[PDB]
């Protein structure tokens, strides 16, 4: 369809999450925690209570929410699922992206993993479920090795969760259709339809031999299923609002649940009515990852809509009450600190500067043309600061801003990218002459300044920061190709740019003509 | 802001607008999405039919406000 150019205004290193965390993976051999950030960055942390700075690395390739991650191959390989419609394959030890799968056509929401087959599956809002052989994915070229997919059909609505068993013999999807759908991943054959839930199902777990399934649903219930009988064998109503996250011990006898009501419970499957409040988190729980160092898990890591990630200890579980008031725990055992998200954005009348407000009520002033921050203004009044900087000037709209990652993402579209002519003098530039500059055209040239095909470097008036992410996407989300501005001179990047840069950008950046 | 529009089939579509946008802008955005001429459109908000020349803030239309699209069955 119609191809948009975007870029992110940010620092070269974003040490802290800038948004909530969608998913968690624990490498037990290296004591490393992976977080899948809503800020589009995956980060590796050390979980040694020794280290003063648990940050290890950021893995920067996605353009939107990272919704799920799966550590494969004894921690060598990470696979990620994002709202940018892609699945990416990472070297988890060195922290770089190796391949990008683009078979999904909407937000990819869930990943599933069959350890014994090195099989992963992806599913999203497009109602598709693709199956991927992990050993098959490392494809350097089209002759030595083309990656191939296999997919399942039947989902009548957007898929929100997905699980496989360890043996890779059962796969289950959860969706807004309120039925769980089951296939054999080996044959892609439909096996059964599990009916019972009255709302979306965002959490799924299978036991080791794929004979029982636990589902967590926005209707507030947890349901246990027998796959041999194709029926529900127990329903648990331990939450007040939607259940979004489930974990289970190795024995498949205690289930840990969390969701919108922020409360996290451990409930015994053999005696449902006895449930224990482990803690109440500070924000809706999105995902939980048990620490499995010991059979009775010593701790549980919890991801929420906040940028902080808390580890809660479990030492002291040996109750009676069905609706406990007092949480078992009150303070996290470890805390990985997060940063603020930009939650409000106003484009000024000059169509050049932006005022932001973040979750700390801090206000900043940015230069869209130079792709950078200008000054932090502290905790001033946001609307009073807007009215204070009002200038009676009209410039046609020529970009759009989005806050989906918590950082500033600027998008250019062919329809209005070239709408804003300004004079060199009023834009603060100097060569001398004072001709008329097109803002979108100069920016496009700065974004592709390192692309050799644009040479005869840059636009002659300003540069963007070299680390600026440059994104080529389809209208309404779907990323085609993403690179950093400085990397355009690469052999891989120049080939991929030639394949992805739309002719309406080529016109300005290559042919040098409006 | 994002407003809702109930089309002739009963299907809801979203429109990105601003409070200072005139009703003519909204009808032109519906023409972009539904191919219906603006002079042939009739838009109801909470029982009140919108008039050209006025803006969305004149009718106190906010985010998640629903406009109902109909036509003029002249007889």
């Amino acid at each position: 369809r119609k191809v948009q150019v975007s870029y992110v205004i940010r620092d070269e290193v974003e040490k802290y999450n800038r948004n909530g965390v969608n998913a968690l993976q624990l490498d037990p051999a290296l004591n490393r925690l992976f977080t899948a950030g809503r800020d589009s960055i995956i980060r590796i942390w050390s979980v040694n209570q020794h280290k003063q700075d648990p940050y290890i690395a950021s893995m920067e390739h996605h353009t939107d929410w990272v919704n799920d991650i799966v550590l494969c191959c004894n921690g060598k390989t990470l696979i990620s699922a994002s709202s940018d419609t892609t699945v990416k394959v990472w070297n988890a030890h060195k922290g770089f992206c190796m391949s990008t799968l683009r078979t999904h056509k909407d937000y990819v929401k869930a990943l599933a993993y069959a350890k014994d087959k090195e099989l992963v599956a992806s599913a999203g809002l497009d109602r598709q479920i693709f199956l991927w052989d992990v050993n098959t994915l490392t494809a350097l070229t089209a002759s030595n090795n083309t990656v191939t997919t296999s997919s399942l059909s039947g989902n009548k609505d957007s898929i929100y969760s997905l699980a496989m068993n360890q043996l890779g013999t059962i796969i289950v999807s959860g969706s807004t259709e309120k039925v769980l759908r089951v296939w054999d991943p080996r044959t892609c054959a439909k096996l059964m339809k599990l009916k019972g839930h009255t709302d979306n199902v965002k959490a799924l777990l299978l036991n080791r031999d794929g004979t029982q399934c636990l589902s967590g649903s926005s209707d507030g219930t947890i349901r246990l299923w027998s796959l041999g009988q194709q029926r529900c064998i127990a329903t648990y109503r331990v939450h007040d609002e939607g259940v979004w996250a489930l974990q289970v011990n190795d024995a498949f006898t205690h289930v840990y649940s969390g969701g919108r009501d922020r409360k996290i419970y451990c409930t015994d499957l053999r005696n449902p009515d006895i449930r224990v409040l482990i803690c109440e988190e500070k924000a809706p729980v999105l995902k939980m990852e048990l620490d499995r160092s010991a059979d009775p898990p010593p701790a549980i890591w919890v991801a929420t809509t906040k940028s902080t990630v808390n580890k809660w200890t479990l030492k002291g579980i040996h109750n009676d009450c069905t609706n406990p008031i007092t949480p078992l725990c009150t303070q996290p055992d470890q805390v990985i600190k997060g940063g603020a998200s930009i939650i409000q954005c106003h484009i000024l009348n000059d169509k050049r500067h932006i005022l932001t407000k973040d979750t700390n009520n801090n206000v900043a002033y940015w230069d869209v043309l130079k792709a950078c921050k200008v000054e932090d203004l502290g905790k001033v009044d946001f609307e009073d600061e807007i009215k204070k900087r009002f200038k009676m000037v009209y410039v046609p709209n020529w970009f759009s801003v989005d806050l989906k990652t918590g950082m500033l993402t600027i998008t250019l579209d062919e329809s209005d990218c070239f709408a804003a002519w300004v004079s060199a003098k009023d834009a603060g530039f100097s060569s001398g002459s004072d001709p008329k500059l097109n803002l979108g055209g100069l920016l496009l040239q700065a974004l592709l300044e390192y692309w050799p095909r644009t040479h005869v470097k840059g636009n002659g008036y300003f540069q963007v920061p070299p680390h600026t992410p440059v994104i080529f996407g389809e209208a309404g989300g779907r990323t085609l190709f993403r690179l950093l501005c400085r990397d355009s001179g690469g052999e891989t990047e120049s080939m991929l740019l030639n394949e992805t840069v739309p002719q309406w950008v080529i016109d300005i950046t290559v042919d040098k003509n409006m | 802001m994002q407003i809702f529009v109930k089309t002739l089939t009963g299907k809801t579509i979203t429109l990105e607008v601003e409070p200072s946008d005139t009703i003519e802008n909204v009808k032109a955005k519906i023409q972009d999405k539904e191919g219906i001429p603006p002079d042939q459109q009739r838009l109801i908000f909470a029982g009140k039919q919108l008039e050209d020349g006025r803006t969305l803030s004149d009718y106190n239309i906010q985010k998640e406000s629903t406009l109902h699209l109909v036509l003029r069955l002249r007889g």
């Binding site: 809503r38 957007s158 806050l403 | 042939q40 009739r42 029982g47 998640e64």
Partner: protein, 337 residues
């Protein structure tokens, strides 16, 4: 020769759009009594909305008098029994100059203009009285309270908007036969918003999938159903849909209500349009007699008002023409039982 005691309405030059809804308003339960009360308040205290109330009382009395003139000695009249509503047309021309001339117009649009102006009168007289039931006229007869629920499927936050409504804008076909149950469900039932048209969750700060539902909260005495008997392709470009819905006699909005009720509504009036295009056509009305003076030979039958003309059609014979043709339904009026 076989003349009827019910009064028609002269066509003054493409004014069947006005005559159709006026004949429906006359037969609405509280309308006649209500405009008399609003006339009696303006007659005490005190142009614009006041003139519209007087014009409405001028016509209603003119219709009531002409019927009494016929019931006294019907041998005075031959093959016609109708009155002209010129004062109401002139005030409407002053309220909206589009009604000037003699062009064709939408019946729903003129009903909205009349009811909306009467309500402005009620609210203007509420202020002039309180500064020093009647003014509840439009609100208890035709107007209802709607509840539009939007639920982000990401965070499951459910926001709400209360909007008033006087009719229920309803689709006729999808783009074999669709019932009215289907059609109201297209309006009110859950509608998932997905794909290249995603809801923007301000809490999530992200485009998300959403579930939208509309619920009826406060319901009035008359439920108006406004059918969208037309569609567009983009090819003047627009077209009428001649095939209508399967129209029931009894209606209940319990399944789309905010709270369980046992209120059932009964169809009593239908406004129809005849023509292949939207640009022009012919409006008529059809009204069922229900509930007081010796005229009970007709109770249960359907009177058809075609401008100055008026017929009596049978319950079964009219009901067949209402569903799949000649004229096609455009408005449906139900009333509480």
């Amino acid at each position: 020769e076989n003349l009827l005691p019910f009064v028609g309405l002269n066509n003054l030059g493409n004014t069947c759009y006005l005559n159709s809804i006026l004949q429906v308003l006359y037969f609405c339960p509280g309308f006649k009594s209500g405009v008399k009360h609003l006339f009696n308040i303006i007659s005490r205290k005190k142009l614009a909305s006041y003139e519209l109330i007087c014009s409405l009382q001028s016509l209603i009395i003119s219709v009531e008098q002409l019927q009494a003139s016929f019931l006294l000695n019907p041998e005075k009249y031959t093959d016609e029994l109708a009155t002209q509503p010129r004062r109401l047309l002139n005030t409407l021309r002053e309220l909206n100059p589009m009604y000037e001339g003699y062009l064709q117009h939408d019946a729903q649009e003129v009903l909205q203009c009349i009811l909306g102006n009467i309500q402005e009168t009620c609210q203007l007289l509420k202020k002039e009285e309180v500064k020093n039931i009647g003014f509840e006229l439009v609100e208890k007869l035709f107007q209802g309270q709607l509840v539009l629920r939007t639920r982000c499927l990401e965070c499951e936050s459910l926001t709400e908007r209360r909007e008033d409504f006087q009719d229920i804008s309803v689709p006729v076909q999808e783009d074999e036969m669709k019932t009215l149950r289907w059609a109201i469900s297209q309006f009110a039932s859950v509608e998932r918003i997905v794909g290249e048209d995603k809801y923007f969750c301000e809490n999530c700060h992200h485009y998300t999938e959403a579930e939208r539902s509309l619920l009826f909260d406060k319901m009035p005495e008359v439920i108006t159903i406004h059918l969208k008997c037309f569609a567009a392709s983009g090819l003047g470009g627009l077209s009428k849909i001649n095939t209508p819905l399967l129209t029931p006699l009894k209606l209940s909005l319990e399944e789309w209500s905010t709270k369980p009720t046992n209120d059932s509504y009964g169809l009593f009036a239908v406004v129809m349009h005849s023509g292949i295009t939207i640009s022009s056509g012919h409006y008529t009305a059809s009204v069922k007699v229900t509930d007081e003076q010796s005229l009970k030979e007709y109770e249960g039958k359907w009177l058809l008002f075609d401008d100055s003309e008026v017929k009596v059609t049978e319950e079964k014979d009219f009901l067949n023409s209402l569903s799949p043709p000649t004229s096609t339904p455009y408005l449906l009026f139900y009333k509480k039982l």
